[PDB]
């Protein structure tokens, strides 16, 4: 597997304007449900358009040459959130698809989950490869364009019974989901690189998850069915 080149040119750094994780408790959130797994060794598609291109059309409407942005994912427990993902953008072109930015940070991941989860090609959805049952729970995505936030909650359900025989379950035993934070703690400031660690951009992240998956007999699906506003079964 060759190391993927960047997609487009961009200056890559560890940080831009934000040194602390933005709060996910920043308003109500539209609820979606990931579609059920055919078999527990499959892939779960936390996918759902946040209709962020409107905010890109307005930036062209008001004639702003660039927009800034950031995306973050969270695991919601009880009154509090676990970190999962964060990435920041700067000088993005509103006339292009989301993410086409001259300045971006390396994604910051919670590494145990990075072993079998990785972003989609549009950078707005997540893919959960062959998950153990413990991955059940509520996942919140924060999309922010020019200070304006779009929250989505994804509820992930998996069959009781069968757990995929090669699911990554080792790190979880030891570290689990990591520290659980309240809106207070977010306000005080939860350092991005203290609790999240820099990783590969979406293309090389994909090749590593793909390389592990293959090594277990499976292969990444070509396309993924988005999440629904309702439960199935």
């Amino acid at each position: 597997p060759t190391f993927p080149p960047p997609a487009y040119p961009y200056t890559e750094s560890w940080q831009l304007t934000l040194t602390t994780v933005p709060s996910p408790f920043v308003g109500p959130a539209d609820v979606y449900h990931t579609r059920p797994l055919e078999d527990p060794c499959g892939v779960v598609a936390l996918i759902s358009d946040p209709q962020v291109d409107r905010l890109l059309n307005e930036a062209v409407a008001h004639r702003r040459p660039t927009y800034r942005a950031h995306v973050a994912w969270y695991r919601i427990a009880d009154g509090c959130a676990h970190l999962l993902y964060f990435i920041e953008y700067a000088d993005c072109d509103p006339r292009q698809v989301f993410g086409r930015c001259r300045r971006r940070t390396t994604p910051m991941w919670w590494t145990p989950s990075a072993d079998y989860m990785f972003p989609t090609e549009d950078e707005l959805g997540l893919l959960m490869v062959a998950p153990g049952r413990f991955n059940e729970g509520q996942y919140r995505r924060l999309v922010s364009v020019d200070g304006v936030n779009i929250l989505t909650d994804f509820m992930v359900a998996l069959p009781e019974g069968q757990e995929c025989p090669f699911a990554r379950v080792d790190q979880h035993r030891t570290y689990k989901f990591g520290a659980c934070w309240s809106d207070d703690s977010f306000k005080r400031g939860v350092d991005v690189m203290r609790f999240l660690t820099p990783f590969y951009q979406q293309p090389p992240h994909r090749e590593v998850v793909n390389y592990w998956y293959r090594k277990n007999g499976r292969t990444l699906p070509r396309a993924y069915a988005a999440a629904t506003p309702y439960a199935i079964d």
Binding site: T174, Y175, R194, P198, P204, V208, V209
Partner: protein
């Protein structure tokens, strides 16, 4: 691996990566302490953007020579609270995250 250090003193923590096969790129090294229930990161090195040291270690932790053939930092002025497991996490391609561990005892 087990290491021993004395208070007020300094210890040199090593990164124990074994044999990096052909043809894995080693992209990154992250130092991590297991505390309270999970990890938090202590310091990170990446030839791409260099070196970062995180609170509360901002004035006690420093890389020696920045490399994966090393991975070696210096803890200064040891404290009871430093005892514990230190993880050395390596971001390799295409193998993914590879880690090693050491127990520190402060006497």
């Amino acid at each position: 691996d087990s290491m021993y250090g004395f208070i007020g003193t300094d210890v040199v923590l090593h990164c124990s990566f074994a044999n990096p096969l052909p043809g894995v790129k080693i992209t990154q090294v992250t130092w991590q302490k297991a505390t309270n229930g999970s990890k938090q990161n202590v310091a990170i090195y990446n030839p791409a953007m260099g070196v970062s040291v995180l609170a509360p270690y901002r004035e006690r932790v420093e890389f020696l020579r920045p490399s994966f053939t090393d991975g070696t930092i210096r803890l200064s002025r040891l404290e009871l609270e430093d005892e514990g497991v230190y993880i050395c996490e390596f971001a390799t391609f295409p193998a993914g995250n590879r880690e090693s561990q050491l127990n520190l005892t402060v006497m």
